[PDB]
Amino acid sequence: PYTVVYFPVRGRCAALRMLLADQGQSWKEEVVTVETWQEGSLKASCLYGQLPKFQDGDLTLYQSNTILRHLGRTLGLYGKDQQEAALVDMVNDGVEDLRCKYISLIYTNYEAGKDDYVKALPGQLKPFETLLSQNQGGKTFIVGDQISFADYNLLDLLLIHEVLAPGCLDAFPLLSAYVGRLSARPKLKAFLASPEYVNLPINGNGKQ
Amino acid sequence: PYTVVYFPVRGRCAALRMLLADQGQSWKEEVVTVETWQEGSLKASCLYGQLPKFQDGDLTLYQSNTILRHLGRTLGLYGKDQQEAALVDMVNDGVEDLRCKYISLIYTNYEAGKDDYVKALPGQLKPFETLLSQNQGGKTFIVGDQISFADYNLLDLLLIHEVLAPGCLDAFPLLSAYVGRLSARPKLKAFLASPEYVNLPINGNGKQ
Ligand SMILES: N[C@@H](CCC(=O)N[C@@H](CSC1C([N+](=O)[O-])=CC([N+](=O)[O-])C=C1[N+](=O)[O-])C(=O)NCC(=O)O)C(=O)O
Ligand SMILES: N[C@@H](CCC(=O)N[C@@H](CSC1C([N+](=O)[O-])=CC([N+](=O)[O-])C=C1[N+](=O)[O-])C(=O)NCC(=O)O)C(=O)O
């Protein structure tokens, strides 16, 4: 019953598509061209002048996380209790803080400090490796014994980092095995090798 | 009760202190200082190298939005349903992107951005005024007919721009009657005039 609006990019939507495609779900897509947003026909119709946009039938939503937390809750991808759902919310704000830092490296400074960003990236990644070493051994998901929407938000932030700085996971043993076992999950490994996701750019400016 | 470990400023905890003061809660502050945080060991033990940290007993926490959704779903401020609970995450994530850009100029360019961040404001609060006129007539809370942590964070976001650009709400009626109707709330009008709030810096660098 879903629909997703966005530009023909991977951007802030590549993570909510991985959970829908791996959850055994299905959805329709809608798209905005590079010029339909250069018109006003859609930037004023949005609650913040931006996309992704979502539909759940009679509902609509904005913000990449309101949709990621909305499908975790309506699909049981939010933890098992009030506290796992707090440690599943703690990984996501950190995961949304380092991507908010990656969005500025790919759109406002990739040529004047794109190497000062890979220089401090290990420490930006130690935190999540520190939580897996503190999990069931790192042999599970990022929280509890079940997967959550935080796993698809970190698995993409970890997937798009292996592309701007190859070998950024060689110091993090557990993130290297957790990022290899989730892309191997049957329905998501089928979505990563598809043209639907293999043919769009990670970003809108074309850099990576 | 709970505990808050943060710098002697209002910064990121100012909304949960209004949530814990307006919700009949009690708590302790573990004030921290630039002489204590520069000592190192307190920041090297944080999960991301930052504050505030917070607790509910054995459960520790970091990330200010995680503490607002965790006190939100534990205090009964997270919606009456799943779709109102996502319509609350939509107002909190937007109040966080405005608060995410109000925090970068205050600490990274207050002398070259305070003349452009203020003419770009009108357009940043319209959404929030549109959501009130789009619910209960705007005579209630930002979402549903009940209060939420999204409401304790959008009010703090409106009390601070009222300090960087006083008179920024003069064209946003429902937003001007809502920042006074929430400050009139009994236990919130009593804590907001209290010493631990008024003698605290909104920010931690001098500007505002
Ligand atoms: N916090 C919100 C932020 C949403 C957001 O930033 N949306 C951007 C797309 S992201 C990114 C991007 N960008 O950050 O500026 C621009 C882009 N593009 O094609 O022009 C594509 C992007 N992408 O990630 O694919 C947008 O609507 N941009 C239109 C505008 O600003 O007028 C969320 O998580 O949903
Ligand atoms: N997403 C996290 C971010 C938490 C965070 O940014 N904490 C900052 C305080 S915020 C802000 C601030 N800042 O953003 O850099 C610095 C500050 N100070 O006194 O030095 C005070 C701040 N404040 O808001 O009062 C911190 O620990 N800073 C220490 C460090 O970076 O080493 C959350 O929401 O909790």
Coordinates of all heavy atoms in Angstrom, one line a residue, chain A residues 6-7 9-12 37 43 49-52 63-65 96 103 107 202-204, chain B residues 97, ligand 1:
Chain A
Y6 N 10.6 10.9 -4.7 CA 12.0 11.3 -4.6 C 12.5 11.6 -6.0 O 11.8 11.5 -7.0 CB 12.8 10.1 -4.0 CG 14.1 10.5 -3.3 CD1 14.1 11.6 -2.5 CD2 15.2 9.7 -3.4 CE1 15.3 11.9 -1.8 CE2 16.4 10.0 -2.7 CZ 16.4 11.1 -1.9 OH 17.5 11.4 -1.1
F7 N 13.8 12.0 -6.0 CA 14.5 12.3 -7.3 C 15.1 10.9 -7.7 O 15.1 9.9 -7.0 CB 15.6 13.2 -7.0 CG 15.2 14.5 -6.3 CD1 15.3 14.6 -4.9 CD2 14.6 15.5 -7.0 CE1 14.8 15.8 -4.3 CE2 14.1 16.6 -6.4 CZ 14.2 16.8 -5.0
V9 N 17.5 9.3 -7.6 CA 18.7 9.1 -6.8 C 18.6 8.0 -5.8 O 17.6 7.5 -5.5 CB 19.1 10.4 -6.1 CG1 19.4 11.5 -7.2 CG2 17.9 10.9 -5.3
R10 N 19.8 7.7 -5.1 CA 19.7 6.7 -4.1 C 19.5 7.4 -2.7 O 18.8 6.9 -1.9 CB 21.1 6.0 -4.0 CG 20.9 4.4 -4.0 CD 22.3 3.8 -4.2 NE 22.5 3.4 -5.6 CZ 23.5 2.7 -6.1 NH1 24.4 2.2 -5.2 NH2 23.7 2.5 -7.4
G11 N 20.1 8.6 -2.6 CA 20.0 9.4 -1.4 C 19.4 8.9 -0.1 O 19.7 7.8 0.4
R12 N 18.5 9.7 0.5 CA 17.9 9.5 1.8 C 16.8 8.4 1.7 O 16.1 8.2 2.6 CB 17.3 10.8 2.3 CG 18.3 11.8 2.9 CD 17.8 12.5 4.1 NE 18.9 13.0 4.9 CZ 19.1 12.6 6.2 NH1 18.2 11.8 6.8 NH2 20.2 13.0 6.9
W37 N 11.2 19.7 -10.2 CA 11.5 20.3 -8.9 C 12.1 21.7 -9.1 O 12.3 22.5 -8.2 CB 12.4 19.4 -8.1 CG 12.4 19.8 -6.6 CD1 13.2 20.7 -5.9 CD2 11.6 19.2 -5.6 NE1 12.9 20.7 -4.6 CE2 11.9 19.8 -4.4 CE3 10.5 18.2 -5.6 CZ2 11.2 19.5 -3.2 CZ3 9.9 17.9 -4.4 CH2 10.2 18.6 -3.2
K43 N 7.7 21.7 -4.8 CA 8.5 22.1 -3.7 C 7.7 22.9 -2.7 O 8.2 23.1 -1.6 CB 9.7 23.0 -4.2 CG 10.6 23.5 -3.1 CD 11.8 24.1 -3.7 CE 13.1 23.4 -3.3 NZ 13.0 22.9 -1.9
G49 N 9.5 21.5 1.8 CA 10.0 21.8 0.5 C 11.0 20.7 0.1 O 11.8 21.0 -0.8
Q50 N 10.8 19.6 0.7 CA 11.7 18.4 0.3 C 11.1 17.0 0.2 O 9.9 16.8 0.6 CB 12.8 18.4 1.4 CG 13.2 19.7 2.0 CD 14.6 20.1 1.8 OE1 15.5 19.7 2.5 NE2 14.8 21.0 0.8
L51 N 11.9 16.1 -0.2 CA 11.6 14.7 -0.4 C 12.8 13.9 0.3 O 13.8 14.5 0.6 CB 11.6 14.4 -1.9 CG 10.4 14.8 -2.7 CD1 10.4 14.3 -4.1 CD2 9.1 14.3 -2.0
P52 N 12.6 12.6 0.6 CA 11.4 11.7 0.3 C 10.0 12.0 0.8 O 9.9 12.9 1.7 CB 11.9 10.4 1.0 CG 13.1 10.7 1.8 CD 13.7 11.9 1.2
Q63 N 10.3 13.4 6.0 CA 11.4 13.0 6.8 C 11.8 11.6 6.5 O 11.0 10.7 6.6 CB 11.1 13.2 8.3 CG 10.9 14.7 8.7 CD 12.0 15.6 8.3 OE1 13.1 15.1 8.1 NE2 11.7 16.8 8.1
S64 N 13.1 11.3 6.3 CA 13.5 9.9 6.0 C 13.4 9.0 7.2 O 13.2 7.8 7.1 CB 15.0 9.9 5.6 OG 15.5 11.1 5.0
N65 N 13.4 9.6 8.4 CA 13.3 8.8 9.6 C 11.9 8.6 10.1 O 11.6 7.5 10.7 CB 14.2 9.4 10.7 CG 15.7 9.3 10.4 OD1 16.3 10.4 10.3 ND2 16.2 8.1 10.2
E96 N 22.3 9.0 11.9 CA 21.7 10.1 11.1 C 22.6 11.3 11.3 O 22.5 12.3 10.6 CB 20.3 10.4 11.5 CG 19.9 11.9 11.2 CD 19.7 12.2 9.7 OE1 19.5 11.3 8.9 OE2 19.7 13.4 9.4
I103 N 26.6 14.1 4.0 CA 25.9 14.9 3.0 C 26.5 16.2 2.7 O 26.3 16.8 1.6 CB 24.4 15.1 3.5 CG1 23.8 13.7 3.8 CG2 23.6 15.8 2.4 CD1 22.5 13.7 4.5
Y107 N 28.2 17.4 -1.0 CA 27.4 18.5 -1.7 C 27.9 19.9 -1.4 O 27.5 20.8 -2.1 CB 25.9 18.4 -1.3 CG 25.2 17.1 -1.7 CD1 25.1 16.0 -0.9 CD2 24.6 17.0 -3.0 CE1 24.4 14.9 -1.2 CE2 23.9 15.9 -3.3 CZ 23.8 14.8 -2.5 OH 23.0 13.7 -2.8
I202 N 24.6 7.3 -6.0 CA 24.4 7.3 -4.6 C 23.9 8.7 -4.2 O 23.1 8.8 -3.2 CB 25.7 7.1 -3.8 CG1 26.2 5.6 -4.0 CG2 25.6 7.3 -2.3 CD1 27.7 5.5 -4.2
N203 N 24.3 9.7 -4.9 CA 23.9 11.0 -4.7 C 23.3 11.8 -5.9 O 23.1 11.2 -6.9 CB 25.1 11.8 -4.1 CG 25.7 11.2 -2.8 OD1 26.5 10.2 -2.9 ND2 25.3 11.7 -1.7
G204 N 22.9 13.0 -5.7 CA 22.3 13.8 -6.7 C 23.2 14.6 -7.6 O 23.0 15.0 -8.7
Chain B
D97 N 15.8 19.8 12.3 CA 16.5 20.2 11.1 C 16.6 21.7 11.2 O 17.6 22.3 10.6 CB 15.9 19.8 9.8 CG 16.6 18.6 9.2 OD1 17.7 18.3 9.6 OD2 16.0 18.0 8.3
Ligands
LIG1 N1 15.9 15.4 7.2 C1 15.2 15.2 6.0 C2 15.9 15.8 4.8 C3 15.4 15.5 3.4 C4 16.2 16.2 2.3 O1 17.3 16.8 2.6 N2 15.8 16.1 1.0 C5 16.5 16.7 0.0 C6 17.1 15.6 -1.0 S1 18.8 15.0 -0.4 C7 20.1 15.2 -1.6 C8 20.1 16.7 -2.0 N3 20.4 17.7 -1.0 O2 20.7 17.3 0.1 O3 20.4 18.9 -1.3 C9 19.8 17.1 -3.3 C10 19.5 16.1 -4.3 N4 19.1 16.6 -5.7 O4 18.9 15.7 -6.6 O5 19.1 17.8 -6.0 C11 19.5 14.8 -4.1 C12 19.8 14.3 -2.8 N5 19.8 12.8 -2.6 O6 20.1 12.4 -1.5 O7 19.6 12.1 -3.5 C13 15.7 17.7 -0.9 O8 14.5 17.7 -0.8 N6 16.4 18.6 -1.6 C14 15.7 19.5 -2.5 C15 16.0 21.0 -2.1 O9 16.8 21.1 -1.1 O10 15.5 21.9 -2.7 C16 14.9 13.7 5.8 O11 15.7 12.9 6.4 O12 14.0 13.4 5.0

